[PDB]
């Protein structure tokens, strides 16, 4: 008789399941943003649709509409804070033109790639999940982290981990001892 810890499904699969031209387009993204499966594209696909739907709704309203104005600029404010919407594309008409990669680019996946650190999205992947990265003090090990503007310049290597300082890994710190166990004594 408690209270439900409410939940929500994050994605939605396409209608017609065997469009070749979609499956080509889909596969492309998976490769350049280093994706694991189609669900990571669906999840974002879904995201966009709620934005466009929320958007296209406010637009039917007359301007000066306290809801439209409040709840529009709010959307725009959030969309910019992450780098999905351009610094002067701040109009509802412009959020409607948002395409999938706009979100995909801001992926902490593709950011460990972009600003050095990785020189490979499929290196950026294992870099993140293997906790070899941090926004400041915080190790973020989720590839779909979504890097906001102000944090963009704080995605340095980990405070632990070899790649960031203090100690090397156990495979390093084992060769260094195995070249001693035999070659020395």
């Amino acid at each position: 008789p408690r209270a439900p810890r409410t939940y929500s499904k994050t994605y939605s699969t396409p209608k017609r399941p065997y469009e070749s031209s979609r499956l080509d387009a889909e596969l492309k993204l998976a490769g350049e943003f280093g994706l694991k499966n189609k669900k990571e594209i669906y999840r974002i696909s879904f995201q966009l649709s709620k934005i466009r739907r929320a958007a296209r709704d406010l637009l039917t309203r007359d301007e000066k509409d306290p809801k439209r104005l409040f709840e529009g600029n709010a959307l725009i404010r959030r969309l910019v804070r992450v780098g999905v919407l351009s610094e002067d594309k701040k109009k509802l008409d412009y959020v409607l033109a948002l395409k999938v990669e706009d979100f995909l680019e801001r992926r902490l996946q593709t950011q460990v790639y972009k600003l050095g650190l990785a020189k490979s999205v499929h290196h950026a992947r294992v870099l993140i999940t293997q906790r070899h990265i941090a926004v400041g003090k915080q190790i973020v090990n989720i590839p779909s982290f979504m890097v906001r503007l102000d944090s963009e310049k704080h995605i340095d290597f980990a405070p632990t981990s070899p790649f960031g300082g203090a100690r090397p890994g156990r495979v390093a710190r084992r060769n260094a001892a195995r070249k001693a166990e035999a070659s020395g004594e």
């Binding site: 080509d24 596969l27 998976a30 490769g31 694991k36 499929h122």
Partner: protein, 62 residues
């Protein structure tokens, strides 16, 4: 309409197909690695074409 037919030969073909075992082989990369493998292959490498490109065209036209 006819209900008692011969049951005598139930399982002919599965029992007379010659048992040949699957060849051992290297594993495919389970995971993101596979999709990557599929991308760099399907349209970065781009193998044999014709006016359509072809995924499984064993022993070709010749």
């Amino acid at each position: 309409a006819k209900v008692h037919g011969s049951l005598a030969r139930a399982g002919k073909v599965k029992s007379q197909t010659p048992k040949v075992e699957k060849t051992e082989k290297p594993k495919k990369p389970k995971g993101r690695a596979y999709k990557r493998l599929l991308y760099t292959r399907r349209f970065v490498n781009v193998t044999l074409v014709n006016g359509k490109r072809r995924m499984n065209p064993g022993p070709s036209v010749q």
